[PDB]
């Protein structure tokens, strides 16, 4: 026996540069990925997230995401101990369509904010959200 | 002159406790709200966000949001100098439907993460996003 | 068995408003405080921190600190499951002498940043470290 | 004319593996480093921090620090817009003597937490503090 997150799914409709987009995101457990174990000893299966972005009949992007897609902007130590939690439509900017992404520490409500930016011609980029602290 | 943000809008479809929900969010400039003046001297008009959540023919929640809806969990100094940027469907939890919310500081890339949780019977709650630090 | 942390101690010399200060901080296990039990089942004894701040022959502040001194700015759920880890001289500001403070969760590298500000006339205030997010 | 931070200085005495250490830290403006400009247009001179760690007659470490010493664990975009604010003694761990370090956004109270670990034989390592977010 081992821990399995529920299958989350959401469809978002929005406009970008005056054109209508449809964004379908589907999270499912991925049994082929390495399992993630916590300090307590409970083993968790990691997830994959399919992001299917379309503009009319055209498919702008159809990618299967895993936490490893953020290996270029997240240190291996925290990335190995975390699981892919979610990818959600956030906003549109002059750069492109921005998605909020998160990897979370299993058995807790703790997560690291990340972002996926997709241009109108399907060029995709990953950025880690920098968290700054204020004293007063 | 008097700077204002573009009108962002998005519609999200998702399931919660096995029932289908439709979430429409509309950000527009609100000329009736107090203006926000930055250190440079540029005056910005603040925004209102209408969140219309429905479950079939029923309307679970239909609220006009402003940064003042977060006055119970954000200090007045930071809140007066910021503008309501966005309210985004994030995920579903046993508590309720969670929305990611943010207020930003004009002419910068800085913003404060907040959250709105709505139950299936329309009970709404506001929270500030807190942090823990992880090292090695 | 009953786990406990080592006794940490440090003495810091610094200037504030042109006057020389001596700051002695001593962490010791406090057997009189309620124990902290983690998810695994290991019970940890909590700590007390004595902060002795002096300016020449005068004692500006001599307080015994516990995690309960931060009950006004930390929720009881998180505070009951954590242990007082440390209080550290950080810097001087126009407000006062700032100390970095932290409460940690046993058997993990997670901890919550907090702060103690002490004025030249010994008026002390507690704050929670908040955050803003920066992207691109 | 241009902005200049005040010269901060602090001496800390502590024990590590049963031996007495003396740690002197001195922050001064460094006119030779590139200046840092904010969104408003105010130019700030960056700082250097001399950390002089001794154990009796021996000098364990005597290094001049700049924000560029953290280039391996902080992205160039945020590092270029920030200035070295401080390096302070935090605690001792089995790895070594840990210092809390911070780079801050000029004209604000915003900073990024970092850490310097120094072993008893002077081997030094840099780590960025990972900030995690909690929703409830």
Q: Tally Cβ neighbours within 10 Å of residue A104.
A: 21
Which chain C residues are within 8 Å of A134, Cβ to Cβ? 129-132
DSSP state of C118: E
Q: What residues contact D47, with CB distance under 8 A and at least 6 apart? A: D5, D27, D28, D29, D30, D66, D83, D84, D85
Q: What residues contact D126, with CB distance under 8 A and at least 6 apart? A: D69, D70, D72, D73, D114, D115, D116, D117
CA-based nearest distance B82→chain A, Å: 15
CA-based nearest distance B18→chain C, Å: 30
Nearest-5° Cα angle at D69, A136 to D120? 95
Which chain A residues are within 8 Å of C108, Cβ to Cβ? 39
Q: What residues contact D105, with CB distance under 8 A and at least 6 apart? A: A132, D38, D81, D82, D111
State the Cα torsion D49-D50-D53-D57 to the nearest 10°: -170
Which chain B residues are within 8 Å of C112, Cβ to Cβ? 130-133
> Which of D100, B6, D81 minimizes the C-alpha distance to C113?
D100
Which tokens sit at C76?
């009881």
Q: Cβ of C112 and B132 within 8 Å?
A: yes
State the Cα torsion B34-C129-A108-C76 to the nearest 10°: -100
Q: Cβ of D14 and C9 within 8 Å?
A: yes
Instruction: Give yes or no for a contact between B99 and B52, defined as CB atoms under 8 angstroms apart.
Output: no
Question: What are phi and psi for residue C10, nearest 5 degrees?
Answer: -160, 150
Which tokens sit at A88?
């959600």
Q: Cβ of D136 and B95 within 8 Å?
A: yes
Which chain D residues are within 8 Å of B131, Cβ to Cβ? 131-134
> Which of C98, C115, C85 minimizes the C-alpha distance to C21?
C98
Radius of gyration, CA atoms only, chain B: 16
State the Cα torsion A116-A119-A123-A127 to the nearest 10°: -30
CA-based nearest distance A73→chain D, Å: 9
SS3 B67: helix
Which tokens sit at D103?
């780079």
CA-based nearest distance C134→chain A, Å: 5
Query: Rounded to whole angstroms, how far apart are CA atoms A40 and B58?
Result: 43
Q: Is A34 within 8 Å of chain D by CB?
A: no
> Which of A112, A97, A107, A135 minimizes the C-alpha distance to A39?
A107
DSSP state of D35: P
Instruction: Give yes or no for a contact between C102 and C85, defined as CB atoms under 8 angstroms apart.
Output: yes
Question: What does each C-alpha distance from D5 to A33, C34, D44, D68 come to in angstroms?
Answer: 50, 44, 8, 18
Which residue of chain B comes nearest to D113, CA vs CA?
Answer: B133
Q: How far is CA B49 from the centre of its chain?
A: 7
Q: Which of C105, C128, C136 sits opposite B109 (nearest CB)?
A: C136
Annotate B73-107 with three-state secondary structure: CCCHHHHHCCEEEEEEEEEECCCCEEEEEEEECCC
Q: What is the DSSP string of C17-53?
A: TTEEEEEEEEEEE-TTSPPEE-SS--EE--EEEEEEE
Which of the residues D106, D133, D136 would you substitute to probe the A interface, choosing the one with the greatest number of A C-beta atoms within 10 Å? D133
Which chain B residues are within 8 Å of D131, Cβ to Cβ? 131-134
Which chain B residues are within 8 Å of D39, Cβ to Cβ? 40, 107-108
Which chain A residues are within 8 Å of D109, Cβ to Cβ? 134-136
Q: Which of C111, C130, C135 sits opposite B132 (nearest CB)?
A: C111
SS3 D78: helix
Q: Cβ of A130 and C133 within 8 Å?
A: yes
DSSP state of D79: H
Q: How far is CA A110 from the centre of its chain?
A: 15
Annotate chain A with three-state secondary structure: CCECCCCCEEEEEEEECCEEEEEEEEEEECCCCCCEECCCCCEECCEEEEEEEEECCEEEEEEEECHHHHCCCCCHHHHHCCEEEEEEEEEECCCCEEEEEEEECCCCCEEEEEEEEECCCCCEEEEECEEEEECC
DSSP state of D3: B
Within 45-104 of D, beta carbons closer than 8 Å to A belong to 75, 78
Residue with tokens 């409830």: D136
Which residue of chain B comes nearest to D117, CA vs CA?
Answer: B136
Residue with tokens 């998605």: A99
Query: Rounded to whole angstroms, how far apart are CA atoms D95 and C9?
Result: 18
Q: How far is CA C24 from the centre of its chain?
A: 13
Residue with tokens 């204002």: B4
Question: What are phi and psi for residue C71, nearest 5 degrees?
Answer: -65, -25
Q: Which of C10, C88, C132 sits opposite D100 (nearest CB)?
A: C88
Q: Cβ of A115 and C98 within 8 Å?
A: no
- What is the resolution in angstroms? 2.2
- Set out the domains of chain C in order of their start, with CATH numbers: 1-136 (2.40.128.510)
Question: What are phi and psi for residue D37, nearest 5 degrees?
Answer: -110, 140
Residue-level length of chain A: 136
Q: How far is CA B37 from the centre of its chain?
A: 20
Instruction: Give yes or no for a contact between C69 and C86, defined as CB atoms under 8 angstroms apart.
Output: no
Chains meeting C at 3+ CB pairs closer than 8 A? A, B, D
Q: Which of C109, C131, C136 sits opposite B131 (nearest CB)?
A: C131
Which residue of chain D comes nearest to A82, CA vs CA?
Answer: D132
Q: Cβ of C88 and D88 within 8 Å?
A: yes
- Residues linked to residue C48 through DSSP beta bridges, in sequence order: C28
């Amino acid at each position: 026996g081992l821990q399995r997150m529920q299958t989350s799914k959401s469809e978002t409709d929005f406009k970008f540069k005056g054109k209508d987009y449809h964004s379908l995101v589907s999270r499912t457990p991925d049994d082929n990925l390495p399992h993630v174990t916590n300090e307590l000893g409970d083993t968790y299966v990691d997830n994959k997230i399919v992001l299917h972005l379309t503009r009319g009949n055209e498919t702008v992007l159809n990618k299967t995401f895993t936490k490893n897609d953020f290996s270029s902007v997240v240190d291996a130590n925290f990335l190995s101990k975390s699981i892919l939690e979610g990818i959600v439509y956030d906003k549109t900017t002059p750069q492109g369509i921005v998605y909020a992404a998160s990897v979370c520490y299993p058995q807790t409500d703790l997560y690291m904010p990340l972002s996926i930016t997709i241009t109108a011609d399907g060029k995709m980029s990953i950025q880690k959200v920098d968290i700054l602290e204020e004293d007063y």
